[PDB]
């Protein structure tokens, strides 16, 4: 039947439209999903947090286990995908984040206002790739590097800011104003986050599970990942 | 080369030693290494966040940045390999963690101490698999990953506690408290870490190639991994 959606198999597809027509909704959220565009980071992250509701014979994460990634949470999205600018847990905890979802303020209580959502427009992605002979050109970096920003993630190129390259270590540089973003436009958090997950191994595309990064032919494995973001307001601390 | 590091690809091995004896050292730590068993989680956190600070061609993140770290970072690691109870890291913040490295306080200055290094003596991993038309014996699932911890990670069999199905999420259930655990065992942490660099395609062992998973020979890939530890202690937030 084909029934799939390609730009994001973190979800559930079924022909039973009118005619058949294949219909798909975000794991997790219900959502809707676009099965030809990079889906908002926000469900994305809700549906990795995703329980299923009847455990059956599987059991559920202690209250008080954790995890290596201290600032992983199901977050509350908003109708249009993006982060609600107020975030809670454990009940009462709150804080605000800014448009990656990254908490940008000292925590408090239920009676903490947000007064909006703050677009991070610049990114630093740092990667360290395993020592290897192909010391690829910077030139024939950029060049597999933005055809990837542009026909994987669907980034428009103004906003590849600039890419750089001193061995072991590439460091893609992503700039976008509210300014300079039309509507429907891939916003550069949405193609970072599946940037960041294609790298890690956990690709979202379907029937890709990770980044097969070949330049001039050549595999390309990175060890190490670190992003920074920068947004329009310092923040609050 | 006749000399290599089976068991932790994260080492520099030479055939220096008197008569060519491979002589092996941990990166980012300097550590000696027993190639016949998995090393520890610290060392190998340290061999992979190892930082060149190189900023010729480079550039630096903004006072102003967030940081998505992954929780990831350069530890501190005792003489046995294990973590230091307390971390820091800026310098000034710093913290307790557990046996795997999980920050289990609430972050604090320079004053902090940590009274002993509390055991991980539980883990959950979740695996979500990429959906096959139908599912697999659970009787061959189950044989299939324990073996896998028999002899891959070199896990005692009387440390895997469980492994449950239910289409298509896969559980594996560790448990090793400090009472069950003689000296030259494994640790489940450590087995933990390795399955998971496995599966995100960071194998790292030098020589065994990769993790190629076959319940009755059909391929299973994993979609979505997400691992929970539970300590002897209840974490102190
Ligand atoms: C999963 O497989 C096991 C292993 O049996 C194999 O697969 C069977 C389909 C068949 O081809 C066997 O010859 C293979 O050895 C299944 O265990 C068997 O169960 C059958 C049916 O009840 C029973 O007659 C046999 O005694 C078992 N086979 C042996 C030799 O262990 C199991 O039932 C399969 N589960 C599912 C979900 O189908
Ligand atoms: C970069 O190196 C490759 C090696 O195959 C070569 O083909 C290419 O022309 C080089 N380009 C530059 C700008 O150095």
């Given at each position: 039947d084909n029934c799939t959606c390609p730009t994001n198999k973190m979800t559930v597809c079924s022909p039973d439209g009118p005619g058949g027509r294949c219909?798909?909704?975000?794991?997790?959220?219900?959502?809707?999903?676009?099965?030809?565009?990079?889906?908002?980071?926000?469900?994305?992250?809700?549906?990795?947090?995703?329980?299923?509701?009847?455990?059956?014979?599987?059991?559920?994460?202690?209250?008080?286990?954790?995890?290596?990634?201290?600032?992983?949470?199901?977050?509350?999205?908003?109708?249009?995908?993006?982060?609600?600018?107020?975030?809670?847990?454990?009940?009462?905890?709150?804080?605000?984040?800014?448009?990656?979802?990254?908490?940008?303020?000292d925590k408090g209580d239920l009676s903490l206002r947000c007064d909006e959502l703050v677009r991070t427009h610049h990114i630093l992605i740092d990667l360290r790739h395993r020592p290897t002979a192909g010391a690829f050109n910077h030139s024939d970096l950029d060049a597999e590097l933005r055809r990837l920003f542009r026909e994987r993630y669907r980034l428009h190129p103004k906003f590849v800011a600039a890419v750089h390259y001193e061995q072991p270590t590439i460091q893609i540089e992503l700039r976008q104003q509210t300014?300079?973003?039309?509507?429907?436009?891939?916003?550069?958090?949405?193609?970072?986050?599946?940037?960041?997950?294609?790298?890690?191994?956990?690709?979202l595309f379907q029937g890709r599970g990770g980044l097969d990064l070949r330049v001039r032919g050549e595999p390309l494995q990175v060890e190490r990942t670190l992003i920074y973001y920068l947004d329009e307001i310092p923040p609050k601390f």
């Open positions: 219909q798909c909704r975000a794991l997790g959220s219900g959502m809707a999903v676009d099965c030809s565009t990079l889906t908002s980071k926000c469900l994305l992250l809700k549906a990795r947090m995703s329980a299923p509701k009847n455990a059956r014979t599987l059991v559920r994460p202690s209250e008080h286990a954790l995890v290596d990634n201290d600032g992983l949470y199901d977050p509350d999205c908003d109708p249009e995908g993006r982060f609600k600018a107020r975030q809670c847990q454990q009940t009462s905890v709150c804080w605000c984040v800014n448009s990656v979802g990254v908490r940008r303020t300014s300079q973003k039309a509507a429907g436009d891939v916003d550069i958090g949405d193609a970072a986050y599946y940037f960041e997950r294609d790298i890690k191994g956990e690709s």
